[PDB]
Design an enzyme around this catalytic site. Structure first.
Site, short mmCIF file in Angstrom:
data_model
loop_
_atom_site.label_atom_id
_atom_site.label_comp_id
_atom_site.label_asym_id
_atom_site.label_seq_id
_atom_site.Cartn_x
_atom_site.Cartn_y
_atom_site.Cartn_z
N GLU C 357 12.56 -27.70 5.32
CA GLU C 357 11.24 -28.32 5.35
C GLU C 357 11.12 -29.52 4.40
OE1 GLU C 357 9.09 -27.66 7.88
OE2 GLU C 357 10.65 -26.22 8.46
N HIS C 487 8.31 -24.66 25.38
CA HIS C 487 8.45 -26.10 25.63
C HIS C 487 8.25 -26.51 27.07
CE1 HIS C 487 10.63 -26.03 21.69
NE2 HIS C 487 10.71 -24.78 22.11
ZN LIG Z 1 11.04 -28.22 10.64
#
Ligand SMILES: [Zn+2]
Ligand SMILES: CC(=O)N[C@@H]1[C@@H](O)[C@H](O)[C@@H](CO)O[C@@H]1O
Ligand SMILES: CC(=O)N[C@@H]1[C@@H](O)[C@H](O)[C@@H](CO)O[C@@H]1O
Ligand SMILES: CC(=O)N[C@@H]1[C@@H](O)[C@H](O)[C@@H](CO)O[C@@H]1O
Ligand SMILES: CC(=O)N[C@@H]1[C@@H](O)[C@H](O)[C@@H](CO)O[C@@H]1O
Ligand SMILES: CC(=O)N[C@@H]1[C@@H](O)[C@H](O)[C@@H](CO)O[C@@H]1O
Ligand SMILES: CC(=O)N[C@@H]1[C@@H](O)[C@H](O)[C@@H](CO)O[C@H]1O
Ligand SMILES: [Cl-]
Ligand SMILES: [Cl-]
Ligand SMILES: [Zn+2]
Lengths: 173, 597, 597, 173
Positions: C357, C487
């Site tokens: 992240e 998706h």
């Molecule tokens: Zn990510």
């Protein structure tokens, strides 16, 4: 009476190899099983026991030992000692640098390098006649006339494939 | 039987006999070079005379075989290799004089000793006395001394003999249907009958000079850079634009700039590619060094050394008491008997040498398959080249770590790399000009394009012009500087070093290509590469049985030698040099000198 | 002035206006996501709506500029990005209908739930109901149940909608001058005007498929292994030569074979790279996890986390009372304000996740220089790729040792390198064919190449041909399995995940190359590297500013997507695999089925 | 009477920065020498005392402070406040997030982004006339017309280079 063959103080030259007849004997062969003192031990037959023989003694160059077997190429197997195609027992060999070789050079051992035709299996040739590639008598000085028997020259410093090896060939029938 | 058939039996007789004399000759030669006793110096001659006498007997006897009337290349080669005349082509009065020369010269050189002008008690012999000075002194005058005394004493001496050596040796050559002794030597590289694989004795000079032109750019920079560096070392003694003083090149002649490293190193703050100290700090002995190189060859697929090697080789100077010659040599005495003779110092230079020496020995082994007359390198250059390929892979920082002479942590970056490259140049690139120049002067002083009264005048012209080296003092024709180097006064072909250096990188290219290697050739280490190992062997085992052009095409794919590879191995150092030299004059003037000042 | 000059001024006014709306919107989105209040979900809309409505207003105004009549790449880039006619090219009926679809699909999927047929009392939502079944159950029929329930309910439902979705979405693409909607998506990879760095919506498929070829051998084996492994887990249900029952694959689709590790572990005796307990045994809080992550990045040369980050981020669940969403995300709100939202547990998988992240955040920081419309990864693939590289270098036993979570005594033995690489390939390599195939179908379905009456009959024509997987129960065009994967029925490009996966393995290679890394690639840790970061920061500072080809070139040295590095990562596993498969069958027959007839 | 400039409750917008004239005063500058309450303080003159002055006040975005210096690129220095080439004294700044920014958004501070030609050192522009890149009157909604003056937007959660900074620029003659 085996230890009387390998253990014989001296050994012959290949061109004049020694055959010893062994009959009405009993031997364990385990005198031969129990040996790291042995560099070559191919037996083109078996490796068991029947407490029952012909021993062939002689000396060769390291790299010449590979010819004491059937179907072999030449020079030693060709003009000295030809083992029979199938017919076979054992071939035993062992390094002897300290015995048949000397730092000064040891040439007692002979071998025939020339000849007119291959030996048959177990054939022999003690002849010593000046050789010529198209028959014909010979008298060196004269050219193209060579003496068949040459010396090995066993030095103690030489490569392994150039050290003396005593070889004993056992045959059965 | 036929004519070819008669020949077969003749050569066979030769082999069996030659092997017996050749061996006793080698065993004699050895016992002498490792133990200089008087009874030893005797037999060294005897066996070596019986050998050379039997060779003669056999040569004239081979002469009775029409090889034109023979169509089996193998036999033709050996028969004609035996159809040799040597110096037997001269008269008795000449052939003894010549040998007396060759011996006197050889002696003078090895027995030469200079003594302190202001101290006629102490004297030094080239090795290790003068040599140490030449390799270590930071003193301008001390180095001037050594350099000048050596050439003054042992040099002025060899002068007469060399002049006569030139004559009798020319005759020898001419009588053998050669132009000069020069032509004789350039003979080694010749090949007749194969098409495209043929090579003439003249085509050498042509190729050599050509190939050499393409090295100039790279050497001029090396030069330019070591000059600047040397200006700091020997403040005031050098011209920014002038040639380099011969006594300041790291050894007695400048044959190799190797010792210049310590004071020309690009990045001193880096952790030294000269593992010399690492070796010293780790208590390495001669044993470790050799057992260490053996392992290397083993890793590529080659065999251990014959147990005989380990029982018979001489790896450390016995010291005094039992004295011996030290030149590092790789012996193939015969009867599969191998050994090395080297007074191993614990230097790095010596650890690399161990490999080059052991390289030869592997090549010797690889072609013991061949008939006696074919056991030898493709040409004179091949054997030296094989040695060097080894010497190459082993000296990379990569290999160094693998061994243990370099911290497992070592972080190979662009500065270390220039250090390693700059070093590799000082040796490899450094000799190229020196060697070419040497052999030219020599070649010329054979076709006799140089008269006795300019012999030196011209030599120094070529040092100044080709090598960009100048002599610190003037030298009149009494001098004979070329002979100050073993090879000359000891009668040895020299271009081998040049040709050798080219093949070196040619082989290396293709060997690393075979070893599926990443990028820059200079970074390659063929250790652990059976594929690469295997490849080399396949050309190694061909002895002299092949024309060097073919054998060289088997490995790299080239009928000839090429300078390209060398040039790439050195591209990084070339472009980094180019820059460095941005504030320097690059090139020189044949006009500047420390004496004419 | 000109048309170019007029445009600068427009884009300018746009920036400053977008920045204020955009920020207001993120601040909204965020507050909602950290505090799920009703007043927040209200403003999260308002602000997002103005933003979106301003975007339209701008796009359609930005339309009044000919970028073809503009020669300044930078400006062209932003202008064209803003020339997002989008679904505004349709008539008001289409555009509203479409949104209804896009929404309805979204809804059904998230809201869908299946109930136990012989216990209709209890139903499960995909998360965490079905999912936990597909991930943990060793029961073939229970697994079959979920798998078939899900696709037969919420699957069959998205069928009708998807068909219309395809039409409506295609018209949209056609009207904007694209061959099809597929062509649209492939657009993301396109480049115009730079030379060599140019790339086309075609040359994607071309590269994608070629790169994928060189992946078959690695996968085919990976396949071969797990099959034999699965044969033992579900004896009798699988064929040695046959495909893999889709419901036995670790998750609801087999997108990742990650969860197969439990029963495919090479050496189940080997212990742990799982410091999950080493962290807990050290009272590690959410603070340490990130402070550490920061330090990591700092090491390679990048900056600290802005004080803002520390003051504003949500690192630990506020528990109940003030509840929040829990997906880990990196927030680039604007006005140089960065932050992460993550419900930090003390798992190694979270300490790793922290890194992935904060990779993002560093990327977001690096390109904050670029004009507002260029701040984003080179492509959809780049941003996730940078995320992973971090995850990778931190997970090495070496780095863990370096930190001091791993006992500085652990012996990284030959076998631990395998359980790791396998648990890796199971995710990284497992998903490649799956991912390709899926966009291979979509791509084709958007070019009519896959007729309506062959949609599902064609899914599995490739589920067997490409992926080596079969349907446990047969499906006719009443089903719409592809749409059961997020998706798909949420209108997201999916090929992103292939190119991402591929990319990251070049990045890591090129960085471990520059970080001077010795051993196998998977043992690499770019910590304390710097010259690595630099090489990375070079492509981080651009985001969308230059063509990815260039951005990618900046870190590797090549203009394209290369599979080679990915393979190098898994080369040690690949060899093992090949030998493992010694007697098992490699490959699969399409025709076999777990239902027959 | 300096603490009646930096310390004044409100501050101007850069586009209409205030020049305060100070003559016949005697101050120490020592009120300024000792200040960690000060982000910037570059004095393109010296750093000494003579106890003798111009004080220009205004607010900019963090990454805009960089422009309150001679020869600086543009936008803030191009169209609002352009320091002179050599001529100078001191530029002083300080973060004011709690004072001039709000978590909700504070947009009171203005600045001019469009204009026709740069301002001369110490020039001012209070004009507020719809702008077209090629002269000509303007009447928005109309296209290619923009209002030259724009709002800053000082949210308190923003990045440092996006937080309000009050700047005071002292000048000597
Ligand atoms: Zn990510
Ligand atoms: C020179 C010679 O005697 N010819 C050899 C022969 O000995 C050998 O058997 C054969 C292959 O084994 O190659 C050669 O033809
Ligand atoms: C068949 C033939 O002519 N080949 C022979 C080969 O056997 C032998 O080893 C060599 C030495 O005489 O010459 C030739 O190459
Ligand atoms: C067979 C071979 O060539 N390698 C051996 C190696 O295995 C052995 O451990 C070592 C010790 O003397 O010597 C040799 O190098
Ligand atoms: C060149 C080199 O690094 N040698 C390695 C050595 O480090 C290692 O101990 C051995 C075991 O795989 O293989 C190779 O010989
Ligand atoms: C390459 C070029 O044309 N230069 C400028 C560029 O430096 C600047 O950032 C941009 C902003 O409008 O205008 C132009 O694109
Ligand atoms: C006023 C203007 O638009 N010009 C700038 C120029 O000062 C800068 O050096 C370069 C890169 O940022 O190009 C523009 O952004
Ligand atoms: Cl000289
Ligand atoms: Cl599916
Ligand atoms: Zn040598």
């Amino acid at each position: 009476p085996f230890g009387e063959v390998f253990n014989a103080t001296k050994f012959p030259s290949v061109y004049a190899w020694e055959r010893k007849k062994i009959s009405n004997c009993v031997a364990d062969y385990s005198v031969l099983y129990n040996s790291t003192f042995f560099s070559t031990f191919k037996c083109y037959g078996v490796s068991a026991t029947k407490l029952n023989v012909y021993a062939d003694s002689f000396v060769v160059k390291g790299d010449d030992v590979r010819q004491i077997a059937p179907g072999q190429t030449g020079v030693i197997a060709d003009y000295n000692y030809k083992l029979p195609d199938d017919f076979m027992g054992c071939v035993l060999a062992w390094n002897t640098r300290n015995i048949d070789a000397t730092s000064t050079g040891n040439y007692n051992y002979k071998y025939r390098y020339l000849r007119h035709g291959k030996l048959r299996p177990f054939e022999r040739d003690i002849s010593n006649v000046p050789f010529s590639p198209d028959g014909k008598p010979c008298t060196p000085p004269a050219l193209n006339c060579y003496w068949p028997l040459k010396d090995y020259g066993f030095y103690t410093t030489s490569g392994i494939g150039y050290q003396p090896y005593r070889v004993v060939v056992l045959s059965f029938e | 039987s036929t004519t070819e058939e008669l020949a077969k039996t003749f050569l066979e007789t030769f082999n069996y006999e030659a092997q017996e004399l050749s061996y006793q000759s080698s065993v004699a030669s050895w016992n002498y070079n490792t133990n200089i006793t008087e009874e030893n110096v005797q037999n060294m001659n005897n066996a070596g005379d019986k050998w050379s006498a039997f060779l003669k007997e056999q040569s004239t006897l081979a002469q009775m075989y029409p090889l034109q009337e023979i169509q089996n290349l193998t036999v033709k080669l050996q028969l004609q290799a035996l159809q040799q005349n040597g110096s037997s082509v001269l008269s008795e009065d000449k052939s003894k004089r010549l040998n007396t020369i060759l011996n006197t010269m050889s002696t003078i050189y090895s027995t030469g000793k200079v003594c302190n002008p202001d101290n006629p008690q102490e004297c030094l012999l080239l090795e290790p006395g003068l040599n140490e000075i030449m390799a270590n002194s930071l003193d301008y005058n001390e180095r001037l001394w050594a350099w000048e005394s050596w050439r003054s004493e042992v040099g002025k001496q060899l002068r007469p003999l060399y002049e006569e050596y030139v004559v009798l040796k020319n005759e020898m050559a001419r009588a053998n249907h050669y132009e000069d002794y020069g032509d004789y030597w350039r003979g080694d590289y010749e090949v007749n009958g194969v098409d495209g694989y043929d090579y003439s004795r003249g085509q050498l000079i042509e190729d050599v000079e050509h190939t050499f032109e393409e090295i100039k750019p790279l050497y001029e920079h090396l030069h330019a850079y070591v000059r600047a560096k040397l200006m700091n070392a020997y403040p005031s003694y050098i011209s920014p634009i002038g040639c380099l003083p011969a006594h300041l090149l790291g050894d007695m002649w400048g044959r190799f700039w190797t010792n210049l490293y310590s004071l020309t190193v690009p990045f001193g703050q880096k952790p030294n590619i000269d593992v010399t100290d690492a070796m010293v700090d780790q208590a390495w002995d001669a044993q470790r060094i050799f057992k260490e190189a053996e392992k290397f060859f083993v890793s590529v697929g080659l065999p251990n050394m014959t147990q005989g090697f380990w029982e018979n080789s001489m790896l450390t100077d016995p010291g005094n008491v039992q004295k011996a010659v030290c030149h590092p040599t790789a012996w193939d005495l015969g009867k599969g008997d191998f050994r090395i003779l080297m007074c191993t110092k614990v230097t790095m230079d010596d650890f690399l040498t161990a490999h080059h020496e052991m390289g030869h020995i592997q090549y010797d082994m690889a072609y013991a398959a061949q008939p006696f007359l074919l056991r030898n390198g493709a040409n004179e250059g091949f054997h030296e080249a094989v040695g060097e390929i080894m010497s190459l892979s082993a000296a990379t920082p990569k290999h160094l770590k693998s061994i243990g002479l370099l911290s497992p942590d070592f972080q190979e970056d662009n500065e270390t790399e220039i250090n390693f490259l700059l070093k590799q140049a000082l040796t490899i690139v450094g000799t190229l000009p020196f060697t070419y120049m040497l052999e030219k002067w020599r070649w010329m002083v054979f076709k006799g394009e140089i008269p006795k009264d300019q012999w030196m005048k011209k030599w120094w012209e070529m040092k100044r012009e080709i090598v960009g080296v100048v002599e610190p003092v003037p030298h009149d024709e009494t001098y004979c500087d070329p002979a100050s180097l073993f090879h000359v006064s000891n009668d040895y072909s020299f271009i081998r070093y040049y040709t050798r250096t080219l093949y070196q990188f040619q082989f290396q290219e293709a060997l690393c290509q075979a070893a599926k290697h990443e990028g820059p050739l200079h970074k390659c280490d063929i250790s652990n590469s059976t594929e690469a190992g295997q490849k080399l062997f396949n050309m190694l085992r061909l002895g002299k049985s092949e024309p060097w052009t073919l054998a060289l095409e088997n490995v790299v794919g080239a009928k000839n030698m090429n300078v390209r590879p060398l040039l790439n191995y050195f591209e990084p150092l070339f472009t980094w040099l180019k820059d460095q030299n941005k504030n320097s004059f690059v090139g020189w003037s044949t006009d500047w000198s420390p004496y004419a000042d």
